[PDB]
């Protein structure tokens, strides 16, 4: 029985520029077993229309998924990705950093 915790990256599809339409990504990888919940947050609240890739896996058998939503960054809006997995006592939040 393997249990591996998700590596999480939160990033934009293109370099973020204020007021310019873009795509916000949360990539979760390196995890096992496959059940996982991933939310994208805007100012601390859950973003509603979030899509994801279908479950796949890497050479070491660990799983990965891309969650994503269209967005338009601004100077003040804060974004984050929240993930829960059997390996996590509490949901883990990773804040988006433009660089």
């Amino acid at each position: 029985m393997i249990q591996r915790t998700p590596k999480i990256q939160v990033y934009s599809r293109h370099p973020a520029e204020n007021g310019k339409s873009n795509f916000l990504n949360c990539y979760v990888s390196g995890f096992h077993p496959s059940d996982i919940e991933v939310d994208l947050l805007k100012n601390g609240e859950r973003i509603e229309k979030v899509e994801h890739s279908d479950l796949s896996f890497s050479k070491d058998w660990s799983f990965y998924l891309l969650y994503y939503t269209e967005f338009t960054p601004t100077e003040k809006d804060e974004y984050a990705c929240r993930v829960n997995h059997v390996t996590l006592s509490q949901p883990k939040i990773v804040k988006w950093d433009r660089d």
Partner: protein, 274 residues
């Protein structure tokens, strides 16, 4: 150059919460073209690339039928594996499979593969010859004995050396603009002070395809591979990939650092500076 078609299957039991879920995805090179999920609102093979979208309803219905048949079968396999390991009825377990084929510059087969994992660990693999097995443990030796008696490898070898390649060839024709072109990375270098004596240099590669890339920081022309933070290569969501590599440097030494980028879509490797 050369191309691959690969399928990835995951079946997950969930005793007391219905029957095991089955999820499949298919790729040509680094491009997803199909997915099937038994828990989907309508469980059907789903196109994920324009060059299989023009395959008509017959192709899709046949794929769908085969996925359902595979899913049921994998549910039996999970039942069998539970037994081999004397595991309780109540626990949840995972079966994974990857298989596929590669072809070369002449459109001919290079190699095939088919590997299985149980609960995230290597279980049994078809060897490179496509005629023999490697079992990871005692339980997998049962599956080996079973497949040897049944000549299972002959069925798998016939598909991997034959029909797998025919499909791959067809997909490469239909999706040539997408599939047979590399896209060079778009690069930039950033800088962040860390303290009164250190700073971070970060070398970015965005928008590249295929996923394979090397980013290396050098000082005075020499590799600093051991001192770099490299992130895992990550999907951009548009079929391309991104990666970055960061090195912490003595403040004032930045001019001696260069980032070296190697990628198929580059005619020559790049050397970048802050």
């Amino acid at each position: 150059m050369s191309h691959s078609m690969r399928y990835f299957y995951t079946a997950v039991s969930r005793p007391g919460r219905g029957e095991p879920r089955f999820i499949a995805v298919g790729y040509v090179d680094d491009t997803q073209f199909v997915q099937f999920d038994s828990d989907a609102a309508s469980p059907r093979g789903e196109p994920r690339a324009p060059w299989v979208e023009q395959e008509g309803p017959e192709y899709w219905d046949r794929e769908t039928q085969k996925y359902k048949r595979q899913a049921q079968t994998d549910r039996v396999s999970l039942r069998n594996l539970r037994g081999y390991y004397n595991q309780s009825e109540a626990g949840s377990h995972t079966l994974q499979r990857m298989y596929g084929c590669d072809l070369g510059p002449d459109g001919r087969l290079l190699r095939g593969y088919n590997q299985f994992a149980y609960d995230g660990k290597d279980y049994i693999a078809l060897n490179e010859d496509l005629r023999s097995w490697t079992a990871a443990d005692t339980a997998a030796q049962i599956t080996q004995r079973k497949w040897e008696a049944a000549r299972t490898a002959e069925q798998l070898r016939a598909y991997l050396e034959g029909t797998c390649v025919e499909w791959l060839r067809r997909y490469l024709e239909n999706g040539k603009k997408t599939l047979q072109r590399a896209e060079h990375p778009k690069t930039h270098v950033t800088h962040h002070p860390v303290s009164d004596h250190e700073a971070t240099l970060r070398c970015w590669a965005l928008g590249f395809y295929p996923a394979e890339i090397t980013l290396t920081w050098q000082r005075d022309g020499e590799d600093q591979t051991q001192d770099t933070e490299l992130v895992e290569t990550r999907p951009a969501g548009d079929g391309t990939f991104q990666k970055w590599a960061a090195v912490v440097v003595p403040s004032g030494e930045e001019q001696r650092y260069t980032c070296h980028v190697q990628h198929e879509g580059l005619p020559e490797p790049l050397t970048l500076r802050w």
